[PDB]
Structure 1
């Protein structure tokens, strides 16, 4: 009878070959040992399935009509308040949330399609909390407010701040408390190329590029302070960001 359908979020659903007397299709899925079941208006594996955890928490799997997105939710045993929600979007990125007793989000883990992550923890009712970005090879740490995420790396008297706005726009700034003009770093941000250019003693020294691939690269200028030299090097560990700030 049934037809297996592959779903975003590493799940499968079995949809009946034919519809019932009401025209509806039966859906069955097994998600981490839990058996979920439902009925659907459509014949392609989309719709709603429900079951329960061993501890009586309610579970619902919602598959969008075009199979592009899945939502896996856990609720209190009466089904009233959310406990956890995982949404896998059509790019196969995911958001995984936990909620407090009021249904307010207390943790949000974003896994980008490329596997890098934003981890927001200890989220309060104002949308503030702790923030981490998990990149390939290293992690950046900072805070979340309702206005932006700010991830901070410190080296000497330099503080590098990577900001991710509420709308997702990246900007980077550098601030150095160094008194000496021979050694003080300053930097300018180019939003078009996502590039922070560092200057010391009125000469450009380095370009730090925050790529659309969620990597950081560093390239030096010649001693003339005007032309780039060599080729950009991808950062592989936090120590190499610190090196770029020296």
Structure 2
């Protein structure tokens, strides 16, 4: 009769085993206790399913042609003003967006494949908002502008800024307002190694590596400031970032 097809986000869609006189396949799924239905000219479980809630809100599930992504939209009763959208990928990454009354994004929660999160709240029409990055062991706080996301850690007169572009590219900078050259921190970012090298009084002191696993490691230099010693150690809490900035 039907074939159950496994989709991202542990969702399932039933597809008819064979096509009708028009060559089309029937699709059925149950999402959040609502039965959705649709038809497709493909036999693999891809296509669009729709349902209508008790309250007249319209639900639409779109399964991409290669089954790599699901988009689950809830609309107002007009079928066009978004209330929410979940987009889930095969790799386990996802996005959840909430919309305001004009159907424009007001909150956006990104879950990466590794389970870390980037959370945008209080999003305004000017593109600004509040940002929080949820990592293994700790969270970073900052802001969103149209230009970029900037997460900030302050320690004494030092400010560490972790910038994330719209496409997820990380760059990091440091500024210290310390008026003494004996203690003022400066830093160089190397985009090629995702590493921030801190210097104090003309001696390199530490490398902070911002890894592809969304972690930070720290490693110290020798007293002459030209050779790394020991091994890189993973930072496990915000206070350990602050320690590296002292």
Name the TM-score class by shorter chain: over 0.9
Aligned counterpart, 1:129: 129
Which structure 1 residue ranges, 4+ long, deviate > 3 Å from structure 2?
none
1:90 deviation in Å? 3.8
1:192 deviation in Å? 0.2
1:168 deviation in Å? 2.5
1:218 deviation in Å? 0.5
Aligned counterpart, 1:114: 114
Higher mean C-alpha displacement, 91-100 vs 205-214: 91-100
Please give the alpha-carbon distance, in whole angstroms, between the structure 1 residues aligned to 2:54 and 2:222: 64
1:56 deviation in Å? 2.3
1:89 deviation in Å? 2.6
What RMSD, in angstroms, separates the aligned Cα atoms of the two structures? Answer: 1.0
Higher mean C-alpha displacement, 66-75 vs 159-168: 159-168
1:146 deviation in Å? 1.0
1:45 deviation in Å? 0.5
Higher mean C-alpha displacement, 118-127 vs 190-199: 118-127
TM-score, normalised with respect to structure 2: 0.97
Aligned counterpart, 2:138: 138
Please give the alpha-carbon distance, in whole angstroms, between the structure 2 residues aligned to 1:31 and 1:193: 43
Give per-residue Cα distances to partners, 1:61-110, cap 9 Å, x unaligned. Answer: 00011111110000001212111111113433111111111121111111
1:23 deviation in Å? 1.1
SS of 2:87's equivalent in the other structure is: strand
Segments of 5+ residues of structure 2 without an aligned counterpart are none
Please give the alpha-carbon distance, in whole angstroms, between the structure 1 residues aligned to 2:90 and 2:147: 26
SS of 1:241's equivalent in the other structure is: helix
Please give the alpha-carbon distance, in whole angstroms, between the structure 2 residues aligned to 1:214 and 1:65: 31
TM-score, normalised with respect to structure 1: 0.97
Please give the alpha-carbon distance, in whole angstroms, between the structure 2 residues aligned to 1:53 and 1:245: 53
Please give the alpha-carbon distance, in whole angstroms, between the structure 2 residues aligned to 1:146 and 1:90: 29
Aligned counterpart, 1:44: 44
Please give the alpha-carbon distance, in whole angstroms, between the structure 1 residues aligned to 2:7 and 2:44: 11
SS of 2:14's equivalent in the other structure is: strand
* Map 1:29-40 → 2, pairs under 5 A: 29-40=29-40
Please give the alpha-carbon distance, in whole angstroms, between the structure 2 residues aligned to 1:230 and 1:122: 43
SS of 2:9's equivalent in the other structure is: coil
Please give the alpha-carbon distance, in whole angstroms, between the structure 2 residues aligned to 1:154 and 1:133: 16
Please give the alpha-carbon distance, in whole angstroms, between the structure 2 residues aligned to 1:186 and 1:15: 60
**Number of matched pairs:** 246
1:53 deviation in Å? 2.7
Please give the alpha-carbon distance, in whole angstroms, between the structure 2 residues aligned to 1:46 and 1:176: 54
